[PDB]
Design a protein around this motif. Structure first.
Motif, PDB file in Angstrom:
ATOM      1  N   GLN A   1      81.969  -9.231  -1.972  1.00 64.98           N
ATOM      2  CA  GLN A   1      80.538  -8.601  -1.303  1.00 64.98           C
ATOM      3  C   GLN A   1      79.863  -8.004  -1.587  1.00 64.98           C
ATOM      4  O   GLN A   1      78.776  -7.803  -2.083  1.00 64.98           O
ATOM      5  CB  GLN A   1      80.011  -9.454   0.028  1.00 64.98           C
ATOM      6  CG  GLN A   1      78.648  -9.043   0.382  1.00 64.98           C
ATOM      7  CD  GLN A   1      79.012  -9.510   1.988  1.00 64.98           C
ATOM      8  OE1 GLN A   1      77.562 -10.298   2.460  1.00 64.98           O
ATOM      9  NE2 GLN A   1      79.554  -9.090   3.265  1.00 64.98           N
ATOM     10  N   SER A   2      80.808  -6.346  -1.553  1.00 64.92           N
ATOM     11  CA  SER A   2      80.546  -5.178  -1.897  1.00 64.92           C
ATOM     12  C   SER A   2      80.365  -5.668  -3.652  1.00 64.92           C
ATOM     13  O   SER A   2      79.964  -4.993  -4.484  1.00 64.92           O
ATOM     14  CB  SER A   2      81.179  -4.531  -1.977  1.00 64.92           C
ATOM     15  OG  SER A   2      81.030  -2.589  -2.443  1.00 64.92           O
ATOM     16  N   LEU A   3      81.394  -5.730  -5.118  1.00 67.72           N
ATOM     17  CA  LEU A   3      80.914  -6.086  -5.991  1.00 67.72           C
ATOM     18  C   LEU A   3      79.202  -6.967  -6.281  1.00 67.72           C
ATOM     19  O   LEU A   3      78.903  -6.706  -7.791  1.00 67.72           O
ATOM     20  CB  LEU A   3      82.684  -6.994  -6.861  1.00 67.72           C
ATOM     21  CG  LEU A   3      82.603  -7.528  -7.910  1.00 67.72           C
ATOM     22  CD1 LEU A   3      81.870  -5.632  -8.878  1.00 67.72           C
ATOM     23  CD2 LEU A   3      83.568  -7.563  -8.417  1.00 67.72           C
ATOM     24  N   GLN A   4      79.385  -8.747  -5.498  1.00 66.83           N
ATOM     25  CA  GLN A   4      77.991  -9.378  -5.427  1.00 66.83           C
ATOM     26  C   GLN A   4      76.825  -8.403  -5.893  1.00 66.83           C
ATOM     27  O   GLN A   4      76.228  -9.045  -6.819  1.00 66.83           O
ATOM     28  CB  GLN A   4      78.480 -10.000  -4.832  1.00 66.83           C
ATOM     29  CG  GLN A   4      79.166 -11.595  -4.925  1.00 66.83           C
ATOM     30  CD  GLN A   4      79.331 -12.147  -3.628  1.00 66.83           C
ATOM     31  OE1 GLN A   4      77.802 -12.210  -3.107  1.00 66.83           O
ATOM     32  NE2 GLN A   4      80.138 -13.423  -4.567  1.00 66.83           N
ATOM     33  N   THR A   5      76.915  -6.847  -4.729  1.00 66.24           N
ATOM     34  CA  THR A   5      75.691  -6.817  -4.782  1.00 66.24           C
ATOM     35  C   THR A   5      75.588  -5.452  -5.807  1.00 66.24           C
ATOM     36  O   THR A   5      74.250  -5.252  -6.065  1.00 66.24           O
ATOM     37  CB  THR A   5      76.000  -5.615  -3.719  1.00 66.24           C
ATOM     38  OG1 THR A   5      76.250  -6.231  -2.610  1.00 66.24           O
ATOM     39  CG2 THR A   5      74.593  -5.127  -3.133  1.00 66.24           C
ATOM     40  N   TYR A   6      76.450  -5.362  -6.526  1.00 63.43           N
ATOM     41  CA  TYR A   6      76.603  -4.316  -7.783  1.00 63.43           C
ATOM     42  C   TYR A   6      76.011  -5.125  -9.037  1.00 63.43           C
ATOM     43  O   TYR A   6      74.751  -4.711  -9.678  1.00 63.43           O
ATOM     44  CB  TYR A   6      77.606  -4.122  -8.030  1.00 63.43           C
ATOM     45  CG  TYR A   6      78.208  -3.159  -9.014  1.00 63.43           C
ATOM     46  CD1 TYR A   6      77.220  -1.694  -9.729  1.00 63.43           C
ATOM     47  CD2 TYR A   6      78.660  -3.670 -10.612  1.00 63.43           C
ATOM     48  CE1 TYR A   6      77.334  -0.930 -11.045  1.00 63.43           C
ATOM     49  CE2 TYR A   6      78.466  -2.687 -11.577  1.00 63.43           C
ATOM     50  CZ  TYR A   6      77.787  -1.691 -11.525  1.00 63.43           C
ATOM     51  OH  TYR A   6      77.374  -1.116 -12.788  1.00 63.43           O
ATOM     52  N   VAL A   7      76.912  -6.115  -9.132  1.00 62.20           N
ATOM     53  CA  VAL A   7      75.921  -7.000 -10.319  1.00 62.20           C
ATOM     54  C   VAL A   7      74.778  -7.619 -10.026  1.00 62.20           C
ATOM     55  O   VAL A   7      73.778  -7.501 -11.409  1.00 62.20           O
ATOM     56  CB  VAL A   7      77.075  -8.329 -10.277  1.00 62.20           C
ATOM     57  CG1 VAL A   7      76.469  -9.422 -11.688  1.00 62.20           C
ATOM     58  CG2 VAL A   7      78.166  -7.514 -10.931  1.00 62.20           C
ATOM     59  N   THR A   8      74.517  -7.666  -8.973  1.00 61.19           N
ATOM     60  CA  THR A   8      72.652  -8.653  -8.589  1.00 61.19           C
ATOM     61  C   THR A   8      71.790  -7.368  -9.046  1.00 61.19           C
ATOM     62  O   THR A   8      71.171  -7.691  -9.627  1.00 61.19           O
ATOM     63  CB  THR A   8      72.686  -8.895  -7.503  1.00 61.19           C
ATOM     64  OG1 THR A   8      73.410  -9.736  -6.802  1.00 61.19           O
ATOM     65  CG2 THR A   8      71.099  -9.228  -6.625  1.00 61.19           C
ATOM     66  N   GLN A   9      72.164  -5.757  -8.543  1.00 61.05           N
ATOM     67  CA  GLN A   9      71.347  -4.787  -8.698  1.00 61.05           C
ATOM     68  C   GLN A   9      70.859  -4.332 -10.147  1.00 61.05           C
ATOM     69  O   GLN A   9      70.472  -3.385 -10.574  1.00 61.05           O
ATOM     70  CB  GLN A   9      71.875  -4.282  -7.442  1.00 61.05           C
ATOM     71  CG  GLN A   9      70.868  -4.095  -5.758  1.00 61.05           C
ATOM     72  CD  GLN A   9      70.933  -3.052  -5.455  1.00 61.05           C
ATOM     73  OE1 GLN A   9      71.772  -1.670  -5.463  1.00 61.05           O
ATOM     74  NE2 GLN A   9      71.171  -3.511  -3.904  1.00 61.05           N
ATOM     75  N   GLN A  10      72.387  -4.449 -10.645  1.00 58.03           N
ATOM     76  CA  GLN A  10      72.330  -4.121 -12.026  1.00 58.03           C
ATOM     77  C   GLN A  10      71.712  -4.866 -13.099  1.00 58.03           C
ATOM     78  O   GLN A  10      71.121  -4.972 -14.095  1.00 58.03           O
ATOM     79  CB  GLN A  10      73.835  -4.729 -12.861  1.00 58.03           C
ATOM     80  CG  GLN A  10      74.626  -3.165 -12.376  1.00 58.03           C
ATOM     81  CD  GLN A  10      74.201  -1.446 -12.573  1.00 58.03           C
ATOM     82  OE1 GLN A  10      73.407  -0.948 -11.531  1.00 58.03           O
ATOM     83  NE2 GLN A  10      74.248  -1.567 -14.086  1.00 58.03           N
ATOM     84  N   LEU A  11      71.365  -6.617 -12.776  1.00 55.04           N
ATOM     85  CA  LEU A  11      70.581  -7.348 -13.275  1.00 55.04           C
ATOM     86  C   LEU A  11      69.138  -7.003 -13.805  1.00 55.04           C
ATOM     87  O   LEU A  11      68.354  -7.833 -13.752  1.00 55.04           O
ATOM     88  CB  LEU A  11      71.027  -9.256 -12.223  1.00 55.04           C
ATOM     89  CG  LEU A  11      72.638  -9.901 -13.024  1.00 55.04           C
ATOM     90  CD1 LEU A  11      72.256 -10.820 -12.052  1.00 55.04           C
ATOM     91  CD2 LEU A  11      72.493 -10.111 -14.670  1.00 55.04           C
ATOM     92  N   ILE A  12      68.736  -6.732 -12.135  1.00 59.26           N
ATOM     93  CA  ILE A  12      67.525  -6.541 -11.769  1.00 59.26           C
ATOM     94  C   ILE A  12      67.045  -4.621 -12.585  1.00 59.26           C
ATOM     95  O   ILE A  12      66.317  -5.196 -13.208  1.00 59.26           O
ATOM     96  CB  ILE A  12      67.197  -6.656 -10.130  1.00 59.26           C
ATOM     97  CG1 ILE A  12      67.560  -7.167  -9.220  1.00 59.26           C
ATOM     98  CG2 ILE A  12      66.030  -5.694 -10.116  1.00 59.26           C
ATOM     99  CD1 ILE A  12      67.545  -6.990  -7.600  1.00 59.26           C
ATOM    100  N   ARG A  13      68.394  -3.674 -12.374  1.00 61.14           N
ATOM    101  CA  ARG A  13      67.974  -2.628 -13.325  1.00 61.14           C
ATOM    102  C   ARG A  13      67.836  -2.870 -15.025  1.00 61.14           C
ATOM    103  O   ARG A  13      66.879  -2.960 -15.335  1.00 61.14           O
ATOM    104  CB  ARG A  13      69.003  -1.737 -13.092  1.00 61.14           C
ATOM    105  CG  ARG A  13      68.829  -1.136 -11.774  1.00 61.14           C
ATOM    106  CD  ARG A  13      69.638   0.227 -11.462  1.00 61.14           C
ATOM    107  NE  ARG A  13      69.665   0.841 -10.800  1.00 61.14           N
ATOM    108  CZ  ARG A  13      70.858   0.228  -8.930  1.00 61.14           C
ATOM    109  NH1 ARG A  13      72.215  -0.705  -9.698  1.00 61.14           N
ATOM    110  NH2 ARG A  13      70.801   0.643  -8.496  1.00 61.14           N
ATOM    111  N   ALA A  14      68.606  -3.633 -15.475  1.00 57.99           N
ATOM    112  CA  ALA A  14      68.887  -4.591 -16.802  1.00 57.99           C
ATOM    113  C   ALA A  14      67.447  -4.849 -17.427  1.00 57.99           C
ATOM    114  O   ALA A  14      66.788  -5.134 -17.904  1.00 57.99           O
ATOM    115  CB  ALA A  14      69.832  -4.987 -17.181  1.00 57.99           C
ATOM    116  N   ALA A  15      66.811  -5.841 -16.201  1.00 59.20           N
ATOM    117  CA  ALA A  15      65.140  -7.596 -16.823  1.00 59.20           C
ATOM    118  C   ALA A  15      64.779  -5.831 -16.557  1.00 59.20           C
ATOM    119  O   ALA A  15      63.829  -5.993 -16.793  1.00 59.20           O
ATOM    120  CB  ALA A  15      65.612  -7.722 -15.423  1.00 59.20           C
ATOM    121  N   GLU A  16      64.667  -4.643 -15.675  1.00 65.47           N
ATOM    122  CA  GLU A  16      63.336  -3.631 -15.772  1.00 65.47           C
ATOM    123  C   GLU A  16      63.981  -2.642 -17.055  1.00 65.47           C
ATOM    124  O   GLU A  16      62.405  -2.213 -17.669  1.00 65.47           O
ATOM    125  CB  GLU A  16      63.302  -2.446 -14.891  1.00 65.47           C
ATOM    126  CG  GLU A  16      62.897  -3.553 -13.155  1.00 65.47           C
ATOM    127  CD  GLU A  16      62.996  -2.349 -12.459  1.00 65.47           C
ATOM    128  OE1 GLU A  16      62.920  -1.431 -12.344  1.00 65.47           O
ATOM    129  OE2 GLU A  16      62.943  -3.121 -10.759  1.00 65.47           O
TER     130      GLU A  16
END
Lengths: 49, 49
Positions: free
Chosen positions: A22-37
């Motif tokens: 769950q702590s690694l899902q949270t990292y990947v999710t927020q990198q997906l959002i940063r990368a899209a920005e």
């Protein structure tokens, strides 16, 4: 794994698996959002070019 | 002769090498529960006190 045998260790390890996963899902999710920005700034700099 | 449970005895074991198999594999004990340690891997482990 050094201190409990399998049948008991399974109960403890799964708490570490789910907590970490769950702590690694949270990292990947927020990198997906940063990368899209950053992508939006790439598509901006590409047209300022 | 043992202690009364209201005046339960305590002894410190330290600066020594153990063999918990001599305890755990003996036939006399009617109960040998262990909490957060496996009775087997206990003999592979090491402690401060």
């Amino acid at each position: 794994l050094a201190r409990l045998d399998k049948v008991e260790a399974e109960v403890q390890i799964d708490r570490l698996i789910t907590g970490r996963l769950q702590s690694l899902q949270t990292y990947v999710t927020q990198q997906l959002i940063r990368a899209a920005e950053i992508r939006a700034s790439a598509n901006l700099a590409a047209t300022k070019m | 002769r043992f202690a009364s449970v209201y005046a339960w005895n305590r002894k410190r074991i330290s600066n020594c090498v153990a063999d918990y198999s001599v305890l755990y594999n003996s036939a006399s004990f009617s109960t040998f529960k262990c909490y957060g340690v496996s009775p087997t891997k206990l003999n592979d482990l090491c402690f401060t006190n």
